Write a protein that binds this ligand. Structure first.
Ligand SMILES: Nc1ncnc2c1ncn2[C@@H]1O[C@H](COP(=O)(O)OP(=O)(O)NP(=O)(O)O)[C@@H](O)[C@H]1O
Ligand SMILES: [Mg+2]
Length: 381
């Protein structure tokens, strides 16, 4: 009878439950309200979530992420050829044309389909809910991007079945976000979703409790990781100017340790004017330290931030509607916490305040949890 909503994110996943028309987003074992979509294999164990992400730089070959970029795709697809330059783990095509992710686990070569890796993240999110509820969970609504095709949706559903979930429904991420905010006649809703890996803009219409996706645009390779990379590239150049041209970029472990700290500084800069990036013994036993102002971060990311408005203009053009006709702008995704992004969007919409009351990296799971409760016969929301 217990049903949960799950955001299966490219970078971070999130689980919620709606009971008595109230939605709890469930914290994991480390107290985090979102969980990295990471799976690692070591000599002794299978790590999922925070524990997998935290040892990525010590075990790059056997730490799997971005399975969402492979799920329901043929290995020969041009998106896979393009994306695989980003992965330190091995991916090969099977005789059925399906990607096979190859790792070493307890001294043995093992291969997994993308939906098997995604099943392990879903199983972790199921266990997070079960620990909180102190009861087994069987039923779930799982979200997917609006642009997901029938193969990607069915592979996501299969991941749920492998994780031990009865998948009540697959619903669109942008629709889930709109459902979270309870969005009176006809309403034009823009979902601006900027996560860790991807940027999705969706224009929805809502007449008589019925959502339709009118238009979608974005960039499958713009997200928080790209802003982290802007800080990494700066720090690499800054280290050169401090340490007689020495090049941190030659050491992939040095880059990963630097990237981890750039991501932390980026988060601090969403609520402070300044942050420190610090890595003890970064490269050649040399300590690295630098102070980054919010202004410098904004400068490094200036083009990427401003270009987020281009897909906004494109969905409005495709829907043949003026920005003045948008009733709600919903901020979704962890990167929408960046003040400069919030200011650019507000200014574009002529000072209209976006809907951002729900922690933006939780809104999709929140909506999924509402839909899961409704489809279980609970009319309280
Ligand atoms: N306070 C913050 N300031 C800036 N970025 C943040 C903040 N909190 C989290 N993030 C970033 O949010 C991103 C993760 O967004 P999230 O919406 O959880 O991912 P997702 O659901 O997996 N989306 P996607 O990766 O696009 O599929 C990471 O790049 C984080 O660094
Ligand atoms: Mg996503």
């Amino acid at each position: 009878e217990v049903a949960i909503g799950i955001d299966l994110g490219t970078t971070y996943s999130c689980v919620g439950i709606c009971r008595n028309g109230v939605v709890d987003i469930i914290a994991n074992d480390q107290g985090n309200r979102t969980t990295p979509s990471y799976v690692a294999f070591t000599d002794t164990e299978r790590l999922i979530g925070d524990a997998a992400k935290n040892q990525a730089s010590r075990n790059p070959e056997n730490t799997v992420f971005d399975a969402k970029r492979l799920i329901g795709r043929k290995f020969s697809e041009t998106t896979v050829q393009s994306d695989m330059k980003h992965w330190p783990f091995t991916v090969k095509g099977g005789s059925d044309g399906k990607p096979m992710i190859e790792v070493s686990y307890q001294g043995e070569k093992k291969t997994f389909h993308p939906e098997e890796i995604s099943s392990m993240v879903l199983k972790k999110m199921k266990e997070v809910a079960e620990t909180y509820l102190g009861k087994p969970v069987k039923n779930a609504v799982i979200t997917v991007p609006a642009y997901f095709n029938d193969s990607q949706r069915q592979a996501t559903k299969d991941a749920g079945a492998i994780a031990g979930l009865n998948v009540l429904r697959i619903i669109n991420e942008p629709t889930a976000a709109a459902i979270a905010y309870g969005l009176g006649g006809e309403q034009n809703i823009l979902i601006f979703d900027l996560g860790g890996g991807t940027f999705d803009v969706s224009l929805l219409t809502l007449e008589d409790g019925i959502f339709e996706v009118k238009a979608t645009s974005g960039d499958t390779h713009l997200g928080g990781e790209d802003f982290d990379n802007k800080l990494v590239n700066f720090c690499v150049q800054d280290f050169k100017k401090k340490n007689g041209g020495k090049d941190v970029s030659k050491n992939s472990k040095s880059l990963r340790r630097l990237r981890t700290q750039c991501e932390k500084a980026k988060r601090v800069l969403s609520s402070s004017a300044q942050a420190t990036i610090e890595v003890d013994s970064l490269f050649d036993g040399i300590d690295y330290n630098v102070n980054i102002t919010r202004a410098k971060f904004e400068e490094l990311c200036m083009d990427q931030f401003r270009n987020t408005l281009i897909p906004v203009e494109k969905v409005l053009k495709d829907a043949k509607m003026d920005k003045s006709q948008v009733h709600e702008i919903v901020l979704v995704g962890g990167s929408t916490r960046i003040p400069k992004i919030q200011q650019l969007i507000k200014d574009f919409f002529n000072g209209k305040e976006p809907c951002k009351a729900i922690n933006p990296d939780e809104a999709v799971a929140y909506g999924a949890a509402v839909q899961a409760a409704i489809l279980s016969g609970d009319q309280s929301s």
